[PDB]
Symmetry: C2
Subunit: 307 residues, 2 copies
């Protein structure tokens, strides 16, 4: 049986698995009134990717395809969504949406870029254009499972019916952002399919631990953040290793790699999320120059040292 | 000795180590008249990071700090941005490093988005103000001085940039004409020389060329098919950094393999310095499916005669 292992990259060396930014801190908060069911950043400890999770870090919250028309001088465009190489995806697969699709309600802010498929007479290279843009996941036109989304620009109609990529930067505004509310991947009054399941602690006195990142804002008063369940680099590691899980819970210790000092312990559940013995809403006051070390397979009722 | 290993992620599962985008293809080209000396994406096979190389994928070609006002007094599109570590702390400039880690390593007009979250909370508010705008960091400006702690950042907007904490998220290039991917910028400005550079790389065995992991890089406008080549993927850097396996010879023999069928498509030399050569001449894409990975098969000599592609 291949032994289970976790990367030794520190928090300050890894990336959020729900938005392509560095991890800023660890965080914990009560969630009994919330359904925590993200679709990016989902991988079991045996390396099974779930939800919309894929492996390319800059592709998290990215979509690509081609614009095919307007969606009234409203600067709204109909964008097909394809696989990364431009091929149509198979919409019968038991997956919620194309991999990497945003997994939250909000107005995702970024840049629309296009490189034409044709070369005009007199040229040797294709034309290009890029503009700031927004993909609103709360629009009735956000239908990525059906192969299209609406993408919007500000004060420019300079968009062609050409291959298009969306590079995410942040959110357009903070007020419409609800990070644990899933969009309708097939549009209004339809239900989602192929979802990664909700996650929660099952042992008394525990809370979820999150890897938290600040997320930029186009405008507005806010201090927006986004929380993921494990770093993207852990997903890549487990996917490659595919080590069998011997119990439902791995005991992990947060360790300073320079001194060996152990700062706290936690449970890494087979389903791909972490719990800690801490109550309340709080950052985790540890240095970013620490990593989680796998120490033992344990029972689900192992009593963690309280933080 | 700890055995040397390479990730089994396929090309289509990995990221370019010189710009934060997926790898699109493998490519080879003659380079005898070029000095191939990138500063991002540099790591020895024993895990020693070189140049400006760091491990956070989205921080490649990113800079952060604070805007202090306009750059000069003759152009309201231009702003002076301090450059700090990601947490906002001043970096130590006496380090034998060419520039803050992740600084762009090429001549060009880097296109992206400047975002600001204010350090202050106004009366009547519980959260800071924010603003983002399209922006350009030109590495050919005499005000591109990241080793001295500042760069000039330009916007099309002329009046909605505050003297506040600022981050630049790279997206691509403003134009293709000024982009020279193998030309290094002056990290300390005009008529100064760069320090702490990762060295140039080149094939030494006759009939060989460098192999690159190539990505398309977006353009704000213009006629062009801009690309950026890296020497190894970012995930390989992260792997070698963590493993720190001793290099037993100067060259690791690697084979490009389909993980589903075991079919070997070609072989290559992975040099201890952190780059790949192949037995191929001419400018050409490598016509293989992206669903393959490089497998480490043996330590060999620098004069191992590769099977010609």
């Amino acid at each position: 049986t291949k032994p289970f292992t976790i990367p030794i990259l520190t928090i300050g060396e890894m990336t959020n698995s729900r938005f392509p930014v560095a991890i800023d801190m660890l965080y914990t908060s009560p969630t009994e009134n919330l359904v925590v069911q993200p679709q990016n950043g989902r991988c079991t400890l045996e390396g099974e990717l779930l939800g919309t999770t894929q492996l390319v870090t800059p592709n998290i919250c990215s979509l690509r395809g081609a614009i095919t028309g307007h969606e009234d001088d409203n600067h709204k465009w109909h964008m097909t969504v394809t696989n990364p190489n431009g091929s149509a995806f198979d919409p019968t697969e038991d997956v919620p949406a194309p991999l990497g699709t945003p997994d939250f309600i909000g107005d995702v802010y970024g840049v629309l870029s296009q490189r034409n498929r044709n070369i005009e007479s007199g040229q040797t290279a294709p034309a290009n254009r890029s503009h700031e843009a927004v993909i609103s996941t709360r629009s009735n036109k956000f239908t990525p499972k059906l192969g299209s989304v609406m993408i919007a620009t500000w004060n420019t109609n300079d968009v062609e019916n050409q291959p298009t990529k969306f590079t995410p930067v942040g959110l357009e505004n903070p007020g419409s952002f609800h990070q644990w509310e899933l969009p309708n991947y097939s549009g209004a009054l339809t239900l989602n399919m192929g979802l990664a399941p909700p996650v929660f602690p099952t042992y008394p006195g525990e809370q979820l631990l999150f890897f938290r990142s600040y997320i930029p804002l186009k405008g507005g008063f806010g201090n927006s953040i986004i929380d993921c369940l494990v770093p993207q680099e852990w997903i890549q590691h487990f996917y490659q290793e595919s080590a069998p899980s011997q119990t439902d819970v791995a005991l992990i210790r947060y360790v300073n790699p320079e001194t060996g000092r152990v700062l706290f312990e936690a449970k890494l559940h087979r389903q791909g999320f972490i719990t800690v013995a801490k109550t309340g809403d709080s950052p985790i006051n540890v240095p970013a120059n620490g990593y989680f070390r796998f120490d033992s397979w344990v029972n689900s009722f192992y009593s963690l040292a309280p933080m």
